[PDB]
Design a protein around this ligand. Structure first.
Ligand SMILES: [Mg+2]
Ligand SMILES: [Zn+2]
Ligand SMILES: [Zn+2]
Lengths: 150, 91, 103, 25, 82, 53, 102
RNA sequence: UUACGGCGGU
RNA sequence: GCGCCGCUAGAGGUGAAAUUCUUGGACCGGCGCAAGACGGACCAGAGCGAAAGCAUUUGCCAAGAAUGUUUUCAUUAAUCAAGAACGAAAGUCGGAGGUUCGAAGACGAUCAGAUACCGUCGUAGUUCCGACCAUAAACGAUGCCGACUGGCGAUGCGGCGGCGUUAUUCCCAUGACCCGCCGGGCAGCUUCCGGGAAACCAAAGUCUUUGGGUUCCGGGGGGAGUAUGGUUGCAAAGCUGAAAC
C-alpha cells in the first residue's frame, strides 16, 4: 500500500492499448518538442509540462508522439535541473514543515510527520546516488536545505 | 567538547548546597542571564540590570519586568484582563 | 489567526521574486521623494515618529502606507531574507496586485 | 490473593531488601 | 456462477467495472472538441482537465477544473472526438 | 422599536429560513434567545415615547 | 470466552470515547456502553389532568412535557430492571421491545 | 438496614 | 463563593439518623459580580489519527487519507537487529492557579469488630506552562505486506450516470432528496467456502492434498518478572534477566 500511511487506495492512470498517434492530431513530432522547449523555459517542471499540453493540445502522451519522455528531451540539450522534480518537492515540503515547527515547538504531530518526510528524502536520495544522478557526496543537510529550494 | 552532563550553569557551586537546591537554581539562573528579544527594536539585547529592571543595549530602553525572567506569567494574565475590562462595558 | 495573512505576505514573497523593491529606512526615503515608490509597508515595531514621517511623505507623494501586522523581524522573514526590516518600498510590482488591493 | 496486590507486596518488599543491602555495605 | 465465460464479457459488464480490473484495461476519459459561441477556433480539451483553459482568439475561460470531469463554463458546443 | 417588533412574528427566523434552503434545508429555525448587554443612560422621554400612542 | 461480538460497546474505529456518568449511582461509564433511556413523560401525571384543566384560565391548554434523558451503568440498569436477562440466542437482535402504549 | 465461619480421609 | 433585597424557621444528608450550616437570619425567590473547571441534549455500532487519543464559534498556519487523472520518475520496494520519535491515567520537579471533585487524614454512622462500603469535611492531586517517567485488560487479548475464495442490506468519503420532486429558481448552473454503478474505509446480517478442542471465524479460510515474503515471541504448574551483574531515572521505578529448590 501507501508508504508512510496505512491506505491501500487503487487510483492511478490507465493507459489505452493503442500506442498510436490519434488520427485527428494533425501535429508533428518536432512541433511538440519545440513547444516543450518554450514552456519549460517558463519555469515549469516535467510533471507539469505534460498536463497543460494534455488539456489544451490533445497530446495524450509525448512518448507516443516523439518516442522519448518529457524529462528525457529536456536532458538531451541541458535545460533540466540538477535536482529531480520528486526530490525537489520533498525538500520543499521538509523545509515548510520544519519552519512551522520552530514557531510551533509544542506540535507533536508536525514533529512526527517531519521524520516521515525526511526519511523519504534519504530513501529517494539513496536511489539517485546509485544511478549516478546525484553526486556520491550529496547530502540532505537541514542547515543548507532552504538553499536548494527556490 | 562535552564538559558536563547534568549540572550545566550550576557547576560553579561545586559539591555544595544540596542537589535539589542547585537543581532549583538552574532554571532561575539561565533565565536571568539570558538575552531576550526586545519588543521595541527587535534586537536580542534585553540584558538584566538590577532585580525587576530590563534594559536594551540599542535604543536604550529600560523595561520594568519580572525578577528572574522578563515576563512574569501573572503580569501577562493581568494585561490580558485589563484590556478586556477596558473594551467590556466601555466604563 | 487562520486564513487571511497570505493575502499580504504571499503577495510580498511574489513581488520579491518578480518585481523590484528596496529595504531599509533611508532607501524608501530616497524612493519616496523622487516618485518611484508605490506602496510602502511599515512594521508594527518601528518608532512612532518614524511611522509619522513616512505617513507624512506618502501623503505628499500620494502613495499608500500598508501597516503590516507583525514584528520588524517578522516582516524580514516575510520578505524572504535573514534581516529585520521596518520599512520597505516596492517600486515595481511584478505581476501581483498589492496596490490594486485595499490600500 | 489478587495479582495486583501480589505485585504491591513484592514491590514493597524488594525496596526493603534493597535497603538492608545498602545498610550492610 | 461457475461457468461464467470471463474471456468474452458483455460490453455492459465491461463498462460497469473499474478502469483497471477489466479484461483489458482502458481509460474512461476522452478528448472533446469545444467550440465557443462566436469564434472560428476548435479547441481540443481533455475531458478530465485540470487547468483554467484559455483560448487564443477569444481568450476567455472555457472550462472549470473540478474533482472528476471538467465543466464547460458557458453553454458551448461539444462533441466527443475519435 | 423596529428590532423588537420584528421578533413577535420572528421574521428573522423566517428570513434565514428562505435564504438557507439552497444549501441544506432547515425546518425549526428560531431566534432562540436575545440577551441585553448595554443600556444608553436612560433618557426619560424615550420610555415616555414607548407608552404613548 | 468472548461473550458478545461487540464487547458491550458500540465503538468500532475508535480508541477512546467520552466518559459520562450514570444517573442513580454517579458511576463513570463510557458513552457507548451506557444504557440510554429518553423519557418524554408528561409533567402532569395523567390521573391529575382533570384537576388542572378545570382550574386553568383556558378551556384548551396544551400541557408541557418533561424531557429527561436518563442514562445508566449496566449495574443499575439490571437492578432497576430496565434491561432484562436474555437467553444465549435471543440476545442477537438490536430491535427494541415494542411500544405497548395503550 | 444487618446475614460471619462449617476438622482429615471415604 | 460574595454583594443588595424579599419573606420565613429550619435546611442538609440517609435504609433510618447523626456529625454540619442556621433569628450576627441558613435554605428558597430576585438582580448583579468574580473565579476556576467543563463544553450537555445534537452524538450514532458515525468520522479522523501510527497508536495514545480527538467535540462551543471564528479565526495564521503546517500536514494527510481516499477519489479523479490518455501527468511525471521508472524498481526507486516489503519486513526490519542496532538505534530513535510519539506515548492514557497515576506519579516526580519548578512556577502560576485553585471552582468542583478528592487518595492521606479528622469526624458521624453501620457492625461482634470497621483501619471498609454510607454521610459531613478536607490535604496532596485533578487545571495551565516547562522538564521528566515510558507503563495499562496500552484489547479486535488477534504483527505488517501481497493475492485468492459466497451472497445481501446499508453506511461514510470522493467519482460517474439516471426518471422525476424541491431551492433566489420568474429558466439556468450548483445544493437537498430519489435510483444505480466504481474505488477506499467503519462495521453488520446470512451461508456446510473452509477451518477449529469447541466457543466461534468471510478470516482465526486457501494446512499430513503440510513451503507467498519477513519481524517479534511461546515450551507443564510454581520459584519469579525473583536473585544477581549491567544500564537508564531526581525519585518511584523501567529494561534485560536466571538458578538452587
Ligand atoms: Mg484489584
Ligand atoms: Zn530595544
Ligand atoms: Zn447505575
Amino acid at each position: 500500500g501507501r508508504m508512510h500511511a496505512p491506505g491501500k487506495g487503487l487510483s492511478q492512470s490507465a493507459l489505452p492499448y493503442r500506442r498510436s498517434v490519434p488520427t485527428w492530431l494533425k501535429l508533428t513530432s518536432d512541433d511538440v518538442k519545440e513547444q516543450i522547449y518554450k514552456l519549460a523555459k517558463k519555469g515549469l517542471t516535467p510533471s507539469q509540462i505534460g498536463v497543460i499540453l494534455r488539456d489544451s493540445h490533445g497530446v495524450a502522451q509525448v512518448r507516443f508522439v516523439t518516442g522519448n519522455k518529457i524529462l528525457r528531451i529536456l536532458k538531451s540539450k541541458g535545460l533540466a535541473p540538477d535536482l529531480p522534480e520528486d526530490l525537489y518537492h520533498l525538500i520543499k515540503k521538509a523545509v515548510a514543515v520544519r519552519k512551522h515547527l520552530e514557531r510551533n515547538r509544542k506540535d507533536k504531530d508536525a514533529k512526527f510527520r517531519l521524520i516521515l518526510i525526511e526519511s523519504r528524502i534519504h530513501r529517494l536520495a539513496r536511489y539517485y546516488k546509485t544511478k549516478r544522478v546525484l553526486p556520491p557526496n550529496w547530502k540532505y543537510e537541514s542547515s543548507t536545505a532552504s538553499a536548494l529550494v527556490a | 567538547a562535552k564538559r558536563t552532563k547534568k549540572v550545566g550553569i550550576v557547576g560553579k557551586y561545586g559539591t555544595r548546597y544540596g542537589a535539589s537546591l542547585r537543581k532549583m537554581v538552574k532554571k532561575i539562573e539561565i533565565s536571568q542571564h539570558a538575552k531576550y528579544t526586545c519588543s521595541f527594536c527587535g534586537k536580542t539585547k534585553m540584558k538584566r540590570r538590577a532585580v525587576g529592571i530590563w534594559h536594551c543595549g540599542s535604543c536604550m530602553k529600560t523595561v520594568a519586568g519580572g525578577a528572574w525572567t522578563y515576563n512574569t506569567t501573572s503580569a501577562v494574565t493581568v494585561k490580558s484582563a485589563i484590556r478586556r475590562l477596558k473594551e467590556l462595558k466601555d466604563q | 489567526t487562520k486564513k487571511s495573512l497570505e493575502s499580504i505576505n504571499s503577495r510580498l514573497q511574489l513581488v520579491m521574486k518578480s518585481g523590484k523593491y528596496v529595504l531599509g529606512y533611508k532607501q524608501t526615503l530616497k524612493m519616496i521623494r523622487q516618485g518611484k515608490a508605490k506602496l510602502v509597508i511599515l512594521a508594527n515595531n518601528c518608532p512612532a515618529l518614524r511611522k509619522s514621517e513616512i505617513e507624512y511623505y506618502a501623503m505628499l507623494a500620494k502613495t499608500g502606507v500598508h501597516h503590516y501586522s507583525g514584528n520588524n523581524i517578522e516582516l524580514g522573514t516575510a520578505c524572504g531574507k535573514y534581516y529585520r526590516v521596518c520599512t520597505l518600498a516596492i517600486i515595481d510590482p511584478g505581476d501581483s496586485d498589492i496596490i490594486r488591493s485595499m490600500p | 490473593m489478587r495479582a495486583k496486590w501480589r505485585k504491591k507486596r513484592m514491590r514493597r518488599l524488594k525496596r526493603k531488601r534493597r535497603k538492608m543491602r545498602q545498610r550492610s555495605k | 456462477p461457475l461457468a461464467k465465460d470471463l474471456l468474452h464479457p458483455s460490453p455492459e459488464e465491461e463498462k460497469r467495472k473499474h478502469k483497471k480490473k477489466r479484461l483489458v484495461q482502458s481509460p474512461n476519459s476522452y478528448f472533446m472538441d469545444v467550440k465557443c459561441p462566436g469564434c472560428y477556433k476548435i479547441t481540443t480539451v481533455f475531458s478530465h482537465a485540470q487547468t483554467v483553459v484559455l483560448c487564443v482568439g477569444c481568450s476567455t475561460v472555457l472550462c472549470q477544473p473540478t474533482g472528476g470531469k471538467a465543466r464547460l463554463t458557458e453553454g458551448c458546443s461539444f462533441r466527443r472526438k475519435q | 422599536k423596529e428590532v423588537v417588533n420584528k421578533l413577535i412574528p420572528d421574521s428573522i427566523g423566517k428570513d434565514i429560513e428562505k435564504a438557507c434552503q439552497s444549501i441544506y434545508p432547515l425546518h425549526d429555525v428560531f431566534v432562540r434567545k436575545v440577551k441585553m448587554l448595554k443600556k444608553p443612560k436612560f433618557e426619560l422621554g424615550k420610555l415616555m415615547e414607548l407608552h404613548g400612542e | 470466552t468472548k461473550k458478545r461480538r461487540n464487547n458491550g460497546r458500540a465503538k468500532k474505529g475508535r480508541g477512546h470515547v467520552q466518559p459520562i456518568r450514570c444517573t442513580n449511582c454517579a458511576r463513570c461509564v463510557p458513552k457507548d456502553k451506557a444504557i440510554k433511556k429518553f423519557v418524554i413523560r408528561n409533567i402532569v401525571e395523567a390521573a391529575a389532568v382533570r384537576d388542572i384543566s378545570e382550574a386553568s384560565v383556558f378551556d384548551a391548554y396544551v400541557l408541557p412535557k418533561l424531557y429527561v434523558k436518563l442514562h445508566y451503568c449496566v449495574s443499575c440498569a439490571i437492578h432497576s430492571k430496565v434491561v432484562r436477562n436474555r437467553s444465549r440466542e435471543a440476545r442477537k437482535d438490536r430491535t427494541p421491545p415494542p411500544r405497548f402504549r395503550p
